[PDB]
Amino acid sequence: HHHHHSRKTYTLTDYLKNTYRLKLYSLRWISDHEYLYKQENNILVFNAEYGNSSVFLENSTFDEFGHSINDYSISPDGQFILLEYNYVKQWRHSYTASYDIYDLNKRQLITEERIPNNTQWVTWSPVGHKLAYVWNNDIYVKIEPNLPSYRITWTGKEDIIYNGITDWVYEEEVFSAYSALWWSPNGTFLAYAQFNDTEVPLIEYSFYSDESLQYPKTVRVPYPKAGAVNPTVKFFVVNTDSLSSVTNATSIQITAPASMLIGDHYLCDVTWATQERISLQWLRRIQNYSVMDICDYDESSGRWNCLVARQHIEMSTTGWVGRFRPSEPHFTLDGNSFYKIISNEEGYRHICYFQIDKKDCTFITKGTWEVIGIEALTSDYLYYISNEYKGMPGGRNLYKIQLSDYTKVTCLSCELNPERCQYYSVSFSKEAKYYQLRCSGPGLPLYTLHSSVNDKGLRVLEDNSALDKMLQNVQMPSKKLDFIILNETKFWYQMILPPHFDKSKKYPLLLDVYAGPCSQKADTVFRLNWATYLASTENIIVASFDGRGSGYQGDKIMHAINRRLGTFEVEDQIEAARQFSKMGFVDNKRIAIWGWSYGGYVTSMVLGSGSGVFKCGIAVAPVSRWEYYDSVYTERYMGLPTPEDNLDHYRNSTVMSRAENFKQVEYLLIHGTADDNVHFQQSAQISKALVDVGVDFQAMWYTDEDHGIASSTAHQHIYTHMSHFIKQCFSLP
Amino acid sequence: RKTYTLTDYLKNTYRLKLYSLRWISDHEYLYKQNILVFNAEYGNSSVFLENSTFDEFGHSINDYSISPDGQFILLEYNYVKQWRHSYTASYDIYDLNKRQLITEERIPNNTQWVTWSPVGHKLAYVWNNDIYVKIEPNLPSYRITWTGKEDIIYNGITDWVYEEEVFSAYSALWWSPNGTFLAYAQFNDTEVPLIEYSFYSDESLQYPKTVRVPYPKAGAVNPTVKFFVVNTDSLSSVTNATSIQITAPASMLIGDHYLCDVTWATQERISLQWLRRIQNYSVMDICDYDESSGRWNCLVARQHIEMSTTGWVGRFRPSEPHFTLDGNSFYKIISNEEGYRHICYFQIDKKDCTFITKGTWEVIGIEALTSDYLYYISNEYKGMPGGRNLYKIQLSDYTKVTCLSCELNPERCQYYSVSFSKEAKYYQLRCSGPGLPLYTLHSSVNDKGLRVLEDNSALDKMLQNVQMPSKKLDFIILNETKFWYQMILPPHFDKSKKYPLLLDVYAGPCSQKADTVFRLNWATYLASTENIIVASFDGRGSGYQGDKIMHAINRRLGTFEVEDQIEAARQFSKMGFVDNKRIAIWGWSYGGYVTSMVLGSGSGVFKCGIAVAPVSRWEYYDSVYTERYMGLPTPEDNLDHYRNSTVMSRAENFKQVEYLLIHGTADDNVHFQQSAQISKALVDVGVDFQAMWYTDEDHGIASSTAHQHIYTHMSHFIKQCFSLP
Ligand SMILES: *[C@@H]1O[C@H](CO)[C@@H](O[C@@H]2O[C@H](CO)[C@@H](O)[C@H](O)[C@H]2NC(C)=O)[C@H](O)[C@H]1NC(C)=O
Ligand SMILES: *[C@@H]1O[C@H](CO)[C@@H](O[C@@H]2O[C@H](CO)[C@@H](O)[C@H](O)[C@H]2NC(C)=O)[C@H](O)[C@H]1NC(C)=O
Ligand SMILES: *[C@@H]1O[C@H](CO)[C@@H](O[C@@H]2O[C@H](CO)[C@@H](O)[C@H](O)[C@H]2NC(C)=O)[C@H](O)[C@H]1NC(C)=O
Ligand SMILES: *[C@@H]1O[C@H](CO)[C@@H](O[C@@H]2O[C@H](CO)[C@@H](O)[C@H](O)[C@H]2NC(C)=O)[C@H](O)[C@H]1NC(C)=O
Ligand SMILES: Cn1c(=O)cc(N2CCC[C@@H](N)C2)n(Cc2cc(F)ccc2C#N)c1=O
Ligand SMILES: Cn1c(=O)cc(N2CCC[C@@H](N)C2)n(Cc2cc(F)ccc2C#N)c1=O
Ligand SMILES: *[C@@H]1O[C@H](CO)[C@@H](O)[C@H](O)[C@H]1NC(C)=O
Ligand SMILES: *[C@@H]1O[C@H](CO)[C@@H](O)[C@H](O)[C@H]1NC(C)=O
Ligand SMILES: *[C@@H]1O[C@H](CO)[C@@H](O)[C@H](O)[C@H]1NC(C)=O
Ligand SMILES: *[C@@H]1O[C@H](CO)[C@@H](O)[C@H](O)[C@H]1NC(C)=O
Ligand SMILES: *[C@@H]1O[C@H](CO)[C@@H](O)[C@H](O)[C@H]1NC(C)=O
Ligand SMILES: *[C@@H]1O[C@H](CO)[C@@H](O)[C@H](O)[C@H]1NC(C)=O
Ligand SMILES: *[C@@H]1O[C@H](CO)[C@@H](O)[C@H](O)[C@H]1NC(C)=O
Ligand SMILES: *[C@@H]1O[C@H](CO)[C@@H](O)[C@H](O)[C@H]1NC(C)=O
């Protein structure tokens, strides 16, 4: 006699086998009024206006193909489809693949002059059907899909010269992309970066492969660790309309400002402003100074001129420039003006309006909140996401501001579904006539389509009723999102609370940590994850805290750990734990901490702190000392590890130096052997230091797994392993 | 009141005293304290060098070495370990008759091997893979070889696989008995593939180093070998030394082969043994110096073949010959018709040898040979394969055999080794168990005891206070055949009680884990403090009991020796004092393989286990060892069984057990690879297990801190498996 009360919980197997599936609604805008979507592997076009859809491409159209198709891309003009197959993953964004082009009009595979195997990147021009691709680190252009390619670059060289694609650090830390090609708006020009890794040292590590491989392979990747020789970069623009089968193409170089050339620098943003005007942002290796150049094509010479009178400097006295890099400009149609996110006088990030000829910009938004991103710009309105609503830095809503009157700001998303929806992202149609809103929480995700004309809702695309239906009699956890005041400053936390949460009781507490610069772990997003299991099934509170160095609340918080990683952010997690115990529903003897990546570092620094607050913790793929990690991320926050810069704090902020203090705690250290990002080295050095002072700890290596430890089997194994460790640390049967 | 603790084991609270002498003549020996010479006669000892004669040397002296004539001492410093035996060092020579360091024409830094000639004070050494000879310590050295090249050509020193698996040594230099000739081998690793692994080094090193070592895994291209002899009495300052090659016999040059033994017979006769890559066929060459030629000749009529139809040849390699004084006769250990290893007497000029020992037991080694007597160690006494005693056989009558050690102290002493003086007039006996080690000195003329050198009374006194475990050594019968086991039994062993049991396994070919040796080790702690029985069992494949048992796993690694550890454990649970809910198993090296194969067997006998630096599949291990037992991993040889004998293939069965897998990341021997493939296989079938890597540790995991950490980590694991707080 169970009286239909909820007795199921969200189990580990539920998490690992995806029993409860979040439904997405992924679409790709092709025009201002149409998008594509998949239904049972068929590709449908949907017309946003009248809600209808015709099948665009049958699920069976490439049955005969003979290869499994990984992805596709349709040309802007709708006449060709690019089919990607033989996908082989490289780093976070990079991969190689084979490509075939299918003619949608003639309904046939192009068979002549095919894109080669092992292609590294492919991109349609933004209009028409020109193709640029990179193969063997060289850029090629096809003006028509069945015609011979024009080789643009001849300097490409494996691990040394990269044309049109990024090297390792630029991929992971600057562009968040493999691609380093930018077509001009109408496809006349093709801009590209060339990276030179010639004297960049190699990280070398073993890759064991299938058990058939008799001798392990040594992988060798150019990787600048902090203070090491960095890649250099050059920027070019080629006119694709004046290509020629008989003469090699002329790439016009756009050189960095002298203020950048006097030392090590980076190329940190590329943005076309018009058909004949491109903006570049460069960044000094000491990343507190950046320069935007605005460069016009000179018709009579066929070269590019960046007028000093249109240079813009963005700098910071309290930290680095930008959240992770200088923000990108959104240009007006005429290219004489642009909008960009920068920190205001009070350290808050807001949209500034620039004319290209003027040094002073004027802020169009302000307040003790921040603009997350500029999402679209029309002639009358600018659309942006911000955390203004209710002063909740972990919320996200879409707003629009009238360009002619800045006091006219409308929230488009705030009141749509206030209880269910407080974390929005947006996808606008090609000229902003429609937009898809994606609400990610705190309720179940919700995908809606809107006409921007008068912001009326057209329809619900996906409302996750199937999941809602399944969860009716499952004892799910809740999320408390709130703040504590420390030194007259709000710091936000979230708690994943077990079902039937009773403040009278004392719960074990797991502190789930990132805490890196501009991190945010206290937000309104709904998640089905390991923490859901721990709270639901194992009755553990899983909490996260955004202390100093956290993002989206201004520079006085975010920049507080400048040049001082492994200090305040570490201390604030410990303090968070003390505060959580102060709240009266936490068992002080069963507080644990875990993190991945920066969170691994913090977890480790906390467990080695001697605080006595934490019984145990898990560090997954942690940084152990900053000199081991890449230059652009590390130096952003730490400067250079030289006696004249910041070597002392590099040396003071290691987990190894704290080995002795791990005698007080139970520690599990986990690392993938093929981690190209945070090298296995980092954990190898932790383990060696703990061994050297005689502290027992648990370890797990993951053969051939990288930073994501994301293989289906490894992912299940690591979470199972961590679950056993936590349960035993907390004496849960 | 107290027990033998883990800290006791880890910190060496209770030390075993050795007595390590080094003979200088037929009646004198050195010993450390200070360095005394001792008389074998009287035991009177005048000092040779004061504890700090080298007070103002400045360098920490690793080891010393006196020239045979006593005129010079060689000081070794700046020791840096390479592999198991190999190392690099700096060297200085001190004139004893003048009392001063030689300062001219010194031995280079990073010298790889140095050796005195067997008489006088000639010196040969290896530096940058080339051989140099010094006639006098202060004079310039003559360069013998010019082909030495790092990782590629090795003159007078072994490459990785020859060091580890053939010679158990770095040196490949062999002086003739009076020092006239210097014989040397030359190895060529040119097409041997490289094992590559990361070395993380000190925290200060920003980018890991990639260590690369030529290492032939099973079936890979092997090193090639050449053998040379040079006359050191006709070296020139003007002309280059002329090294005479001795080529391997035509029966070996037909394919891949190995040089497996070098034994000088006389001043002008050298014996070489060669082994085919398929190691069931070896040939001994006897080569004589020709004065008018200046050449060495090995008559095909003097070739002696040793082969096996049931396995490989030798225990780990063909045995060494012991030539009579005139060098026309020799004695060596070979398998007889019944498959037992016994001493055969060969005449240089003929095919048939005659066995001078016989029976169902084995000769372990020929220890010394005189005109009247051959001295040897065997396990004959009481039919106990795990005992060892010294015997002498009257050369004029083989039926006259005296056991010299059996009856000296039968209770305390059943495991002897021996060190004879230069002409076998005196000998030191070393008893290693079952009681406390006992070192005694004896005169061979009448095999009388002279004196106790070390009796470990100091250790005996300390142990009085400690609840020490006992050893049971006994056998069981499987298929009308005896298989021996030993058990470390906790103190106050109550056979009406049910004890947890840990099976300690090696179980490799020619292994022996059941013996009469006394040990203070991890098992002592587990027995004394944790009341765990620690058992070992010598099944099929095990050694010193004849070929029928040893060759039983020929071409079939990971079969019978694995089943027999399982069957042993079953038998132990039927002994009534074993808790069958708490049986574990662990092992290192081959024992990690077997442990892993056992735990993946699905037998249900074992709750848990620990594999340390295990082999996971035979293609990952070196060619010399692996192929000895497995042949080649090719379709026409033994590929199928290479494929059938992996621990990865048993991954699914690890669901029934708790496994701890441990490996050093700089293991040059069993590559970290092997455990990496185990862990991946267990991950891929969703088996949870425990792991531990040891950063920059090698196959020994022998760094002081790492040693303590692994045993501590393992102890927690077994205690938790056994529900011991
Ligand atoms: C990439 O950068 C390297 C420098 O790291 C350039 O190599 C130098 O080239 C100049 C002129 O040819 C020489 O004087 C230097 O000696 C070179 N230095 C080296 C090889 O370390 C190289 O030219 C660059 N390559 C490209 C294609 O831009
Ligand atoms: C072996 O190396 C040592 C140390 O590097 C040598 O001694 C050094 O010799 C240099 C001259 O080359 C002097 O400047 C140093 O003062 C010496 N250092 C020390 C610590 O002694 C030594 O001479 C080298 N070679 C031999 C044959 O001994
Ligand atoms: C060591 O072995 C290598 C590999 O067999 C020998 O190298 C060959 O030498 C011959 C004649 O000099 C060349 O024609 C081949 O091309 C070489 N092969 C290589 C390098 O792979 C080498 O001669 C041997 N060295 C010694 C000292 O015995
Ligand atoms: C002893 O032999 C060596 C090695 O062949 C000779 O040294 C080489 O001589 C050749 C040319 O004659 C050079 O190309 C080599 O580079 C030399 N050195 C080495 C280390 O290979 C040496 O000349 C010979 N000595 C005498 C006295 O004949
Ligand atoms: C937890 N977490 C993330 O989810 C994403 C991260 N970065 C942010 C900067 C841009 C990308 N490189 C992704 N980082 C930063 C980081 C810090 C380290 F110390 C070591 C490794 C990473 C990494 N991937 C994180 O920590
Ligand atoms: C337990 N144990 C030993 O104590 C000594 C061993 N060898 C015997 C042959 C000569 C030397 N290589 C020492 N072996 C053999 C072995 C087998 C493996 F499968 C993997 C690795 C080793 C190794 N060192 C052992 O197993
Ligand atoms: C939607 O409806 C209109 C009818 O006016 C039609 O012309 C258009 O092609 C339709 N699009 C579809 C079904 O995708
Ligand atoms: C790519 O791969 C396969 C061969 O493995 C072949 O069928 C195809 O023609 C290759 N080359 C190109 C240019 O596609
Ligand atoms: C283009 O450049 C390459 C290399 O610089 C050269 O070999 C090739 O001949 C050139 N082609 C033309 C048409 O100039
Ligand atoms: C693209 O832009 C360029 C530069 O303004 C211009 O010359 C060209 O006419 C444009 N092409 C098309 C097809 O609109
Ligand atoms: C940039 O950083 C360096 C080192 O921290 C500092 O000396 C310099 O003044 C900074 N620049 C600005 C504009 O704050
Ligand atoms: C021991 O005594 C003898 C007796 O004369 C003496 O000749 C010898 O040198 C001594 N040996 C040692 C090592 O003291
Ligand atoms: C050493 O043996 C060699 C070769 O037999 C011989 O020529 C030489 O005379 C011997 N030397 C001495 C001093 O015995
Ligand atoms: C050596 O081994 C091979 C392969 O097992 C076998 O065929 C051959 O007969 C053996 N040789 C001898 C002499 O037994």
Residue numbers in the entry:
A (entry chain B): 34 to 766
B (entry chain A): 40 to 72, 75 to 766
Task: Pull verbatim passages from the article behind this deposition.
Thus, DPP-4 is an attractive target for therapeutic intervention, and inhibitors of DPP-4 have been shown to be an effective therapy for treatment of T2DM. Trelagliptin (SYR-472, zafatek) is a novel once-weekly DPP-4 inhibitor approved in Japan.
The 2-position carbonyl participates in an important hydrogen bond with the backbone NH of Tyr631, and the uracil ring π-stacks with Tyr547. The single chemical structural difference between the two compounds is the presence of a fluorine atom at the 5-position of the cyanobenzyl group. Examination of the environment around the fluorine atom in the DPP-4 active site reveals the proximity of residues Trp659, Tyr631, and Val656. The magnitude of this attraction would be expected to be small but may be responsible for the 4-fold potency increase observed for trelagliptin versus alogliptin.
